[PDB]
Design an enzyme around this catalytic site. Structure first.
Site, PDB file in Angstrom:
ATOM      1  N   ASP A  53      26.154  83.173  45.372  1.00 38.47           N
ATOM      2  CA  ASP A  53      24.920  83.144  44.586  1.00 38.47           C
ATOM      3  C   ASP A  53      25.248  82.894  43.117  1.00 38.47           C
ATOM      4  O   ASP A  53      25.600  83.826  42.388  1.00 38.47           O
ATOM      5  CB  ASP A  53      24.176  84.460  44.747  1.00 38.47           C
ATOM      6  CG  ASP A  53      22.880  84.505  43.968  1.00 38.47           C
ATOM      7  OD1 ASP A  53      22.454  83.427  43.503  1.00 38.47           O
ATOM      8  OD2 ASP A  53      22.319  85.623  43.851  1.00 38.47           O
TER       9      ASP A  53
ATOM     10  N   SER B  13      17.443  69.489  32.489  1.00 36.89           N
ATOM     11  CA  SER B  13      17.275  68.193  33.123  1.00 36.89           C
ATOM     12  C   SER B  13      16.505  67.260  32.198  1.00 36.89           C
ATOM     13  O   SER B  13      15.661  67.687  31.413  1.00 36.89           O
ATOM     14  CB  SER B  13      16.521  68.375  34.441  1.00 36.89           C
ATOM     15  OG  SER B  13      16.172  67.140  35.027  1.00 36.89           O
TER      16      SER B  13
END
Length: 330
Positions: free
Chosen positions: A35, A199
């Site tokens: 994770d 992004s």
């Protein structure tokens, strides 16, 4: 040193991925959920409340000649999906894919919430976010990667998750045969303890690319892709009959649909998520309403590039003095 381990979907939907991990002496092998959105290595154990264990493999520290109780240390964690766990702490030897850390904090669960009990395939979590998020008190503990870093050939790990197939986590090296083209690196902020990046935009299907900054986290422990409501609406508007359902908890779409791809930007580069990766199947057995793999982050507080996005790429988690993320097509 290096390590290399195969990671395997837990079910036919790729709801999560499990990677075998050796703990203790002699080794006890547990299948952990790696994770990159958390920083605790915790396991089902001989100390876990018996009624909260249902098929998981447990770590028994009393059978490990290298286990030592970390006196006074406790831990307690709550995840974004509302699940939680807590307990005490041992140090022990932990190996992943041939890479060994001695003295790793192994957090032994005394209590786990129902969603953990109900998932017999996940024996615990192995956190790979920054150690500043580790929950051990009163002495915070380091992640497996943080402990291994100095010994690694290069201070990196990579995630290569498969679509409906196994993939690989590598530590200490970049497998240049595992991706196509070049790896595009992008800046990371560690201010929230995550692999947080920006992004450069998105496209839906064959549509034009929209240049827009989307701050979010690379999180292997989250199944889906969670993005701003504007972006998610633009995606699902291209699927006839798709709608956001408050009763189901997100966007659903007719199972008869063919889904468009979704592209996200990494600098000037582009990662394409095929439409099939966005199909999470019937909302309930036999239903013709299917659950979408791109959902709004509006109720979260952060955008999350979970498995839906990461499995479309070869992802480098670069833990150099100034961390960065790399993405390549594959």
């Amino acid at each position: 040193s290096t390590g290399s381990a195969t990671t395997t979907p837990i079910d036919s939907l790729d709801d999560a991925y499990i990677t075998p991990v050796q703990i203790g002496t002699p080794a006890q092998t547990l299948n952990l959920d790696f994770d990159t959105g958390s920083s605790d290595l915790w396991v089902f154990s001989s100390e876990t409340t018996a009624s909260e264990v249902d098929g998981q493999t447990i770590y028994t520290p009393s059978k490990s000649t290298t286990a030592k109780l970390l006196s006074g240390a406790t831990w307690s964690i709550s995840y974004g999906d509302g699940s939680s766990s807590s307990g005490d702490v041992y140090t022990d030897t932990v190996s992943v894919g041939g890479l060994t850390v001695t003295g790793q904090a192994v957090e032994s669960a005394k209590k786990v919430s129902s969603s953990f009990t109900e998932d017999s395939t996940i024996d615990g979590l192995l956190g790979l976010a920054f150690s500043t998020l580790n929950t051990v008190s009163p002495t915070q503990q380091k992640t497996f990667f943080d402990n291994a870093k100095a010994s690694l050939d290069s201070p990196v790990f990579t995630a290569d998750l498969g679509y409906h197939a196994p993939g690989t986590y590598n530590f200490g090296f970049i497998d240049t045969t595992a991706y196509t083209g070049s790896i595009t690196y992008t800046a990371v902020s560690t201010k929230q303890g995550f692999w947080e990046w920006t992004s450069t935009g998105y496209a839906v299907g064959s549509g034009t690319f929209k240049s827009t900054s989307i701050d979010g986290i690379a999180d292997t422990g989250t199944t889906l892709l969670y993005l701003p409501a504007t972006v998610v609406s633009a995606y699902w508007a291209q699927v006839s009959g798709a709608k956001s359902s408050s009763s189901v908890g997100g966007y659903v779409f007719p199972c008869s649909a063919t889904l468009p791809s979704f592209t996200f930007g990494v600098g000037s580069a582009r990662i394409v998520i095929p439409g099939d990766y966005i199909d999470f199947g019937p909302i309930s057995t036999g239903s013709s309403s299917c659950f979408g793999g791109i959902q709004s982050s509006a109720g979260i507080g952060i955008n999350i590039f979970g498995d839906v996005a990461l499995k479309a790429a070869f992802v480098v988690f670069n833990g150099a003095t100034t961390p960065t993320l790399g993405f390549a097509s594959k």
